[PDB]
Amino acid sequence: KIEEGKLVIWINGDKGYNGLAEVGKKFEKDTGIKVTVEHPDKLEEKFPQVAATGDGPDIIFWAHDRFGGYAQSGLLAEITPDKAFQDKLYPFTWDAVRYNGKLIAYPIAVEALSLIYNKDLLPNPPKTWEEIPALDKELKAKGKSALMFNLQEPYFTWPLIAADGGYAFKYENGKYDIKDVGVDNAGAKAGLTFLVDLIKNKHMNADTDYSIAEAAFNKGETAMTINGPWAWSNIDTSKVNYGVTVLPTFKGQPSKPFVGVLSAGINAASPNKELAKEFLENYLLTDEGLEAVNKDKPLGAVALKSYEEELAKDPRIAATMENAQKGEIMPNIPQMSAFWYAVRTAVINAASGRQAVDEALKDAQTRITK
Numbered sequence: 001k002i003e004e005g006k007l008v009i010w011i012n013g014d015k016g017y018n019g020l021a022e023v024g025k026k027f028e029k030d031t032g033i034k035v036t037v038e039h040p041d042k043l044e045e046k047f048p049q050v051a052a053t054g055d056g057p058d059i060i061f062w063a064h065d066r067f068g069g070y071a072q073s074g075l076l077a078e079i080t081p082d083k084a085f086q087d088k089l090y091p092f093t094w095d096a097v098r099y100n101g102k103l104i105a106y107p108i109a110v111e112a113l114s115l116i117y118n119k120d121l122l123p124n125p126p127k128t129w130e131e132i133p134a135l136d137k138e139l140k141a142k143g144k145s146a147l148m149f150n151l152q153e154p155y156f157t158w159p160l161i162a163a164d165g166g167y168a169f170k171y172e173n174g175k176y177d178i179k180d181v182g183v184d185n186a187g188a189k190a191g192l193t194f195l196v197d198l199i200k201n202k203h204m205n206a207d208t209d210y211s212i213a214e215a216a217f218n219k220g221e222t223a224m225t226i227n228g229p230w231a232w233s234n235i236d237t238s239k240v241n242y243g244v245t246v247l248p249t250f251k252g253q254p255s256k257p258f259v260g261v262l263s264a265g266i267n268a269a270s271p272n273k274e275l276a277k278e279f280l281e282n283y284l285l286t287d288e289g290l291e292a293v294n295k296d297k298p299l300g301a302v303a304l305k306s307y308e309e310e311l312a313k314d315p316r317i318a319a320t321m322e323n324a325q326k327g328e329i330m331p332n333i334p335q336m337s338a339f340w341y342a343v344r345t346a347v348i349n350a351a352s353g354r355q356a357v358d359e360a361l362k363d364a365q366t367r368i369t370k
């Protein structure tokens with residue numbers, strides 16, 4: 001079914017697949033084994049279909065959170081890196097690729113939101129959320145605003161909501177406790193209260209969405225936004241001299257953005273598991289391998305320490321990794337699907353006044369733990 005003696009790799013069409021193919025060509029030169037890199041449409045839908053019948057690629061690349069469902073269906077091989085190899089990657093990245101206590105993928109790259117700021121409006125960006133109200137008053141007096149970011153989606157508001165002690169699900173022992181949910185605790189209530197107050201006191205509008213925040217920042221109307229590495233290429237550097245830094249703290253605690261870890265899984269049905277391990281450990285997860293992919297399409301921050309130390313000479317990448325290290329690995333369990341919709345509703349209702357902050361989060365907590 002899956003052909004022995006070659007590697008077929010699937011990766012999304014927004015990634016550096018020409019760079020990956022060059023890594024494959026080096027592997028083929030050293031081993032005589034053909035590597036075929038493909039970027040099919042809807043690969044994350046296709047993989048569980050073909051893998052369920054014992055078919056598909058030998059290696060799949062995707063964000064780690066989707067691999068939980070794949071691992072629940074036994075579609076991914078348990079990987080076997082030795083302890084010395086594991087020590088070459090930042091330890092938090094291995095946690096992202098554990099399911100039911102077992103390692104099911106190799107971490108490649110790390111993504112998280114950062115604070116993006118306009119250096120000509122704000123050469124010294126605020127280190128705390130608590131400073132932002134006063135800063136907004138000063139900037140509004142000069143015809144600008146302090147901060148605009150997407151308020152409609154919990155991915156973007158969670159960093160603040162969770163800073164003072166919120167969390168989705170408690171992680172321990174390579175597993176999550178589905179009964180230990182941090183959506184209606186004191187810290188979450190404090191952060192959502194602070195967000196709602198930003199709106200009540202006219203520092204942000206409740207209808208601000210992704211489009212508005214991006215346009216406002218690119219036009220030089222707002223000093224700051226919150227966004228991820230996918231947004232950098234769109235920032236009009238002709239008009240905006242921007243920096244990227246650590247997110248502000250709240251009550252002295254770091255903001256807690258969700259962390260996505262681009263990961264490489266090995267099909268459980270592959271007869272090429274040793275070749276796949278060799279390719280991933282000793283060709284891709286090297287400075288030269290990650291450089292080839294990154295040159296094609298930037299990976300952002302990477303899990304491999306040796307190469308991250310080079311990439312972090314770019315302060316935007318250094319900030320991405322700092323915010324990731326302080327953030328919350330996105331849980332890979334099925335109960336996380338309940339989290340997104342429950343918290344989305346809670347934030348919308350609190351920002352509109354439909355619900356008090358406490359009731360909004362209480363209702364979300366009840367749905368997530370149900």
Ligand code: NA
Pocket residue numbers: 025028034035
């Ligand atoms: Na070839």
Ligand code: NA
Pocket residue numbers: 021024025028034035036037
């Ligand atoms: Na090839």
Ligand code: NA
Pocket residue numbers: 271272273274
């Ligand atoms: Na084999």
Ligand code: NA
Pocket residue numbers: 305306309
């Ligand atoms: Na080092």
Ligand code: NA
Pocket residue numbers: 310
């Ligand atoms: Na170098």
Ligand code: NA
Pocket residue numbers: 184362365366
């Ligand atoms: Na509760």
